[PDB]
Every structure is written in C-alpha cells, then in structure tokens.
Subunit: 316 residues, 2 copies
Amino acid sequence: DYDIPTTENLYFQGAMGATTLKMGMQASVGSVEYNSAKMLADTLEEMSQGEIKLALYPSAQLGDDRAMLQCLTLGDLDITYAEFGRMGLWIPRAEAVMLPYVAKDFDHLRRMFESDFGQGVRDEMLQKFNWRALDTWYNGTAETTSNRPLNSIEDFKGLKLRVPNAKQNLNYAKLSGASPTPMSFSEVYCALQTNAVDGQENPLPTIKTMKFYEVQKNLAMTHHIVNDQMVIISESTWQKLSDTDKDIIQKAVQKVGDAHTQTVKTQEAELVSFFKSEGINVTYPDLEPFREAMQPLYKEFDSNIGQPIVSKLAAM
Amino acid sequence: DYDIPTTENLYFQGAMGATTLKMGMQASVGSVEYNSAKMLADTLEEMSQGEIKLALYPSAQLGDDRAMLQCLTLGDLDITYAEFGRMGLWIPRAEAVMLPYVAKDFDHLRRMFESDFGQGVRDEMLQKFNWRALDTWYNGTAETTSNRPLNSIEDFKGLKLRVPNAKQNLNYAKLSGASPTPMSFSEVYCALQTNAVDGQENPLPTIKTMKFYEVQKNLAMTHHIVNDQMVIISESTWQKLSDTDKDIIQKAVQKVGDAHTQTVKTQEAELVSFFKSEGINVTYPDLEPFREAMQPLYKEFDSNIGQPIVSKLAAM
C-alpha cells in the first residue's frame, strides 16, 4: 500500500529528551472527554516545556476500559479514564457510589471520593492493581426522556423505559415503577421514533448527540445517576517520574479537571435550554419519592457486603 | 453494549458560537504530521479565542487521501493533507515536482509551489475541485539504506532495492542502475532482516519508526525525493468564513508550517546522529551522477506533456 507507519508502529516510539505518556479512552473524537484529554496534553507540554508529552488513543481502539485498566496494571498504558463506581467490579464496596440516587450531586460525589472511604478505595486500587487515581471529573447527570409527560413518580407506572444491560440502570427503571426494557445503545433511537419503547435515560450530552430529543417530546430532570470519570495513572509509570514531573502532572490534571467539570455543568445548562427551544416539555418532578423507592436497594447492599457502606455515603 | 457515542455519531455535531473544522489525514497518532495538526488545532482555538475549533481524524479512518480530497470537494471534510506532487493524478503537470531529483531541497520545492507555475496548479486545484491550498510543509527527504556501503552510483549495480509500487520510486531505483523490487511496506523489514532484499529508500523518520536501522548496516544520503504536505481547505468551507476567521486560519497554518518544517529538519539531523551512534555507516555519495541518470526521464516527461515543465522547474 502506502509507506505510512500505523498507530501500532508508533505506539512504543519514545520521544527524545521527553517522557511520552499514552492515554486511552472509550469516548470518541469530538466528545468532551476527548477534548479535555487534548487540553491535558497541551497543558502538560506547556508546563513541562516539552519534557512531558501526551498521546491520545480514543474510541476504545486499545480495548475497552477493562482491557485498558489491565494495561495500566501491566505498564503498557499510562493513563486512562474510569468511573469511581466502575471500581465496583474489582472492589465491591465501590459500587455503592453508583446505585441510583446515592450521590445527590457532583459535590456529594466529589466528597465521597475525597473521604476516608474514598481514600480507602483508592489505596486498594493502587495496592492491588497499580492504579493511582489522580482526580475525579464530573461527567454528567442522567435524566429521563419520554413520549408523554413525567410530572411525578406516579407517571412511570406502565412506562416502558429503555435501560442498558447495566445493573444499576435496571435498578433505577424497576424500583421507579416503570418496566425496564434492556437494550443495546445502537437501537434506542429507532425504538423511540416508532414508539416501540416509551423513553430512555442518559446525560443531556448523550441525548443531544444521539438526537434522541427529536423522537422524545418530554424531558424529566430525574437526576437519578451522577457520573464522573477518574483520571488514573499507572503506578509503574508514576514511580519512574521525577518529583518535578509528578507535580506538573498532578497540577495539570487538577486544572483540566476543574475546566472539564465546569464545561459539563455549562453544557447541561445549554442543553436544557436547547431542548426547550426545540419544543420539548421539561419537567422537574419531586425527587424524594424516587430516593425513598431506592431504600430497599440500599439496605440490601449494606447487608450483603456486611458494612453500612451506602448509609455512610449518604451522610457525607 | 455501552452508551457511548461513536466517532460517526459525533462527526456532524456542531459547537455553539464556534465553527467546527474537521481535518483528516493518513498519518497516524504519534506522527509528526499528526502532532503538527494538534498544534494547528490549539493555535486556531487560541487565536480565534474559541470561535474556531479543529477535530482530527487520523490513520485514514475517513478513507485514503483520494477519498478525503473528494470529501473536501463535496464539503463533507474541511481540511486534509496532500503532497504537491500528488496533484499529478488530477493535474498531470504537477507530477513533475516529484520526479526523482527535480527538487534539489525543500527551498527549491517551496519556490516551485510559490511560483506562477505553482500558482497555476493551485488555481486549477481550486477551480475544478474546490481545493484551496493554504501552505506547503516540508515532510522529509528520502534516503537509501542497505546491507553494503553505497559510496557512489556505481555501487547501485546489482542492488536489490525495495521500492513501493509507485511510479517515481521505481524510476529512482531503475534509473540509478539498481534492480527494483516492488514490495508492500509491511513486508519490508523482514526482507531486509534475513537479507532477502538488500536495501530500501524512505525519509529518516520512517526508517527509525519501522526500525529498518537495526536491520540495515549502511545509510546513503542520496537526497533523491524531497517531500512535502500541502494544507488544503475545502473552498465551500472557506467561503462560509468571515474575513476575520480567514486570516486567523491562514496565518495559523503559516505558523504551524514554519514549526513543522523546522521540526522535520531537526529530526533529520537527530536521526543521522542516532543512526551513526547505532553503528550505521553513513555515506554522502556524489549526487550529480544520480541527477544525470534521471535526465532521460525528464525530457520524456517534458515531451509527453508537450511543454518544458521539468526544465522550468529545475531553474527555479
């Protein structure tokens, strides 16, 4: 074909005088996640005067998050994203932070992360898996679209609410009184356009990007899942760094994270107004009957694990 | 499986108040071409102070250069790279600038681009195909590796010189007295390692990235093909822009091109020393017998096309 090196050929080529960091992510070119990673790369090159460089591998081209995190464990990848709650697959008590409605908002989720419990989870990520969590970035709060108005929890009765295969999404739809319809992402839009399904749930950027809004006349601000992305660095990569480079990385990640978090909050405000401007009916149902409907979910969790993890988290 | 928008999903999503430009390229993540494109994106964001933004699509994920150039013609892609000489597929006289040894160095090639001949080609690019060429960036001079020294053109006799299945690389190997072996890029390393082939020819960065050096014992600075990349923007995209944004674009491209050109020159000096340090024997054979050996190719071209294209170009 053409004499052009592939991404695989260049992956392990190091830069001279500079420390080349590779970062993978599932999010695609054009996403806020990818844009913030680009900003992180530019800040690192600036703060380090070219001595730290960042190469980006989006769209899960290196594998999914499970594979990419393994690569950090083994030193084959330097940085990746992973949700705080996603740690639950490896450290079961971490799942508590992604049960529907446990995090009231991102300030609450941030406090969970920075607490002794969060530090406990982060210490175990590092001891077992060589995952050093540098920061948590707000990545959006899920809301509920639908083909009829959602003014109260009473309205979910008889709602066929699309939900992905994930356990907590399913817990949300069922414990709310709706009837969950598990389904792959690529089939949601159509399912809603023909009203083969009644609604779905996702953060506002996903609803905009997938154009779900044009097949849904209503949006309810259910605030049922607050999402984050942690920025994780491989511990083997970290210990190779001078204390100067360590500090540049920590400060660059904090700075980009503040901007990322602020950007997501900004986008959510614009999308609500964009959805209203398109004719969508936006409701703010009382959330307390949703938080009470999740109460059996919570004490179940605290029982099997044997510790009051969820109740601890709700008081933070 | 996951609720994560794809690159396809995000491609046509716009930014509010900002003009989203989309850039495709064959070069992969980690290449100098890709890195300069990220610098162009950062410069546009800063000089437009948020009003112009650039999304990058590397590794030919959008198609090859022929497909990407067509996408500019039709308005589906905004910016891409193409070699000045690559225009010869569409505008036949443009091929003259990539015949072996016509361009003595990049200053010569730049003068070719900026002259009335170059302006004539660039005008035809724009009139027929909606390609506005903004600038030309030096992209490296090809050199010759081998398993025995090349001190003069005489040494090319009986040399198994790998070349890609491309007209002008073939002409180089043939007219130099070597015996060309057309060959796909992916197999080149191995043929060289087992000495199944004697040598190849490529810019120094390709030689390092593919690690041909650990397999070849000699490097001859034959300087036989000076390469560039033009930065082309879709004319339909261009006319949508304000005169203010046009100038930001035009002059951001100049700044990044100066740095790209200087960066490729820096790497070439770097790699010659790296190759020597690895034990490679680096020769500087007299190039005049190579340029004379290309002479029947030149007037052949000037004859078929019917005008002294190559002659005009050599005197520039």
